[PDB]
Structures are given as structure tokens and as C-alpha cells.
Symmetry: C2
Subunit: 220 residues, 2 copies
């Protein structure tokens, strides 16, 4: 199923402090190699929040899991019916995002539909005060099994570089549950090691973000 | 000169604690967009040090400098004769690298020839003890003019993620001087914002590192 290059389509509909916006994205992924390649366009004009604060919200099934760890791959075991990914992201000393997404296969395309709502942000805050640089660091995503719920609990902190050399923390509380009733692989504790690079498209005039990502499982 | 896509060739010859090795690399860069794309092969077998500790050593002229900052672009002003880049990199609580390179244009290809010597590393150290993860974070490279010397002084600290969640610091002391006698643009203080993602090549059997980098000037 994830053996080749799989087309991905991402759609987000959000609201941050009353401000409504939409982002649609296209790209493709490659499990075998852990590479993601996505282009996101804010389809309603200008994005009221910085492009980097949506990186984690805008498809972990694309992680390369070395062979000996394939029984720990919850993400692809829930395919192709999918899983629901929920998160509560707390930005240090500022608002929080609450997102719910549904990631399933629609034909041949891996679809990720999300609904984001964020509140409590300050206008003097780095988030709304667009004080965040356009770049991304590497982080370790920590996964554990939620036995009861038949899913996984994921948790990690993101480091956003503010343009004044400081660092904006974003506390992530993640939960994943399958969409189908069938059995699914509950893993042993391990972590995903992700890298991400943001860039632009010279030939794109609409507000957007080009994201390049490499993710590989480890910790076993 | 840097208006299009320029082929790059990198060659390093080094010695770390007696261990001799070579690395040759090929790729191309795109100034207009700040993108670098390089593939490095350790031509003498296995690399005695981790691939990430050589990222900064293994061509800043590829940074995108927005128009209004073009009088601050020392790197491209020294072309095509080039510049000599020297550095002394101190790894926190471990050895240090001392490199000298020469970056000039050879025909159409931008060449970067380096000679690295590093000493004082521990075998129980993260560097020789290969305890560093295969990923890279984003950093701010700080540039100032060395008026007297007719060049620039660059300085920054790199953050290498150790596989046990900790962070290995690498203190960089950089110096750049032109190779030609002609005048060169000495800039105002500003900084380069770089992002880097390491990956592998499925079809490559020789020890190597695939590097993808995006660099843009800022601070003015």
C-alpha cells in the first residue's frame, strides 16, 4: 500500500481568535524513504497565523520504519480506513490550538482533513505578532500505546525560532485512534525522528509554504 | 554569475586523531532561491566521524540576499576569484576541528577544497563514539566586517542532537578573506538564516550523506 509514492491532499479549515482561514495542500510522500513533499496554499488570502505554527497539524504514516520495527507501525496498520488524530497544542505563554483530523485513504490519495480552533492568543504574542522565523528544527516525536483505547499517545515539544534569536515552545499533546473496528498494531515505546525545511515557490503568487520533511522511526 | 543553477564540487581531505579520510561531493546550488543540493561520498570507505559534524565545513555564496541587501553580499562580491574560509570549531567537552578551505570558481563549477584537521577528541566522546543523530537544526549565522583584513568575521554555535535526547554544541569561529586583490563588499552586520535536512540515497552503496539546505540573509 505505502510501497511507492503516494499522492497526498491536505485540507484545513480553521479559526484562531475569530479569524477564519483555509489551507489546502498537495504533495506526495514516500514511506520507503520517509520523504514528504508538500505545497500548501492559504486559499482565503493571507494566513492570520505564521506558516510554521501549522507544520505539525498539516501524516505520520509516511515515516520510514526500518524492517525490524514493522510491528510498531500503528500509523500504516490503521490503513487504509485510517485513524483520527487529535491534539492539544499549548504555545508557551500564549494561546493553544485544538485540532481534530481524519486521515484515511480516498482512492489512491492519502487525505488529511483537519479542523483547527485556537484561542487565547495575544496580539502582542509571537504567534499573532508574527515574530517567528521561517524555518524549522528537528525533533523527536515520542510514541506509546494507549492499550485501552486501541491506539497511541504521542507527545513532544516543538521549538520555533523567534526572529530575535529567542525560542517559542509549542507543547503537543497527541492522540491517535483507528477509524475501523479491525485489529491494529499497538507499538512498543519508540520515537519518530523528524527533520523539516520550509521554503517558497518563485512561481507561486498565492500565500503559501513549501515543506520538505524526512521522518524515520527509532528507539528499538 | 550566480543568476542560475551553478554546479558545485566539494573536496575535503582530513585527519581526526590520526584517522585519515576523504570526502568528495557533488550537487548544485541556486542563489536566487538559496537552495543547495549536495551528495557527499566518503571516498576512502567509512567516515571515522559522523556525517553531521562536517555539515558546516562541507559554500555560503549560495545564500539568497533579498535585493535591498545586495551591498552586504561579501561572498558573491569576492567571485569569481574566490575567498579563503578558515574556521576553528570547538565541540563542547571534546576535540576541535581546524579547517581551511578555498572557494573559487573553476570554469563553471564552484569549487570548495578543504583541508581538515581535528584533535583532542575522546573515544568516549559523542563525536568518535558516534552518539549523534542523523539530523540538523536551523541556526543563525552572524556576520560582521573585518575592516582591516578586508573580509568578514562569522560566528555561531551549532546544535547537534545526540541520540539520547541531549544536545552537542559546536562553537564556530569563522574568518573569510578574498583571494583577489580587487575591492570587495564589506557588509553591515546581518545574519544568514540556514535550514538543513540530511538524508540517504537508496541507490547509493558507498558511505555518504545527502544534504539539502536553504539559506537566506536577514537582519537589515
Amino acid at each position: 500500500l505505502f510501497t511507492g509514492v503516494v499522492p497526498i491532499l491536505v485540507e484545513l479549515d480553521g479559526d484562531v481568535n475569530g479569524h477564519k482561514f483555509s489551507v489546502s495542500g498537495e504533495g506526495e510522500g514516500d514511506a520507503t524513504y520517509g520523504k514528504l513533499t508538500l505545497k500548501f496554499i492559504c486559499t482565503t488570502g493571507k494566513l492570520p497565523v505564521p506558516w510554521p505554527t501549522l507544520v505539525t497539524t498539516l501524516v505520520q504514516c509516511f515515516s520510514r520504519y526500518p524492517d525490524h520495527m514493522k510491528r510498531h507501525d500503528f500509523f500504516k496498520s490503521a490503513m487504509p480506513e485510517g485513524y483520527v488524530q487529535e491534539r492539544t497544542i499549548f504555545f508557551k505563554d500564549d494561546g493553544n490550538y485544538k485540532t481534530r483530523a481524519e486521515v484515511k485513504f480516498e482512492g489512491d490519495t492519502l487525505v488529511n482533513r483537519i479542523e483547527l480552533k485556537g484561542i487565547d492568543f495575544k496580539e502582542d504574542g509571537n504567534i499573532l505578532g508574527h515574530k517567528l522565523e521561517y524555518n524549522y528544527n528537528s525533533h523527536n516525536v515520542y510514541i506509546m500505546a494507549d492499550k485501552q483505547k486501541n491506539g497511541i499517545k504521542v507527545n513532544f515539544k516543538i521549538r520555533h525560532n523567534i526572529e530575535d534569536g529567542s525560542v517559542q515552545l509549542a507543547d503537543h499533546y497527541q492522540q491517535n485512534t483507528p477509524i475501523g473496528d479491525g485489529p491494529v498494531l499497538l507499538p512498543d515505546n519508540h520515537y519518530l525522528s523528524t527533520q523539516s525545511a520550509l521554503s517558497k515557490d518563485p512561481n507561486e503568487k498565492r500565500d503559501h509554504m513549501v515543506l520538505l520533511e524526512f521522518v524515520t522511526a527509532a528507539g528499538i
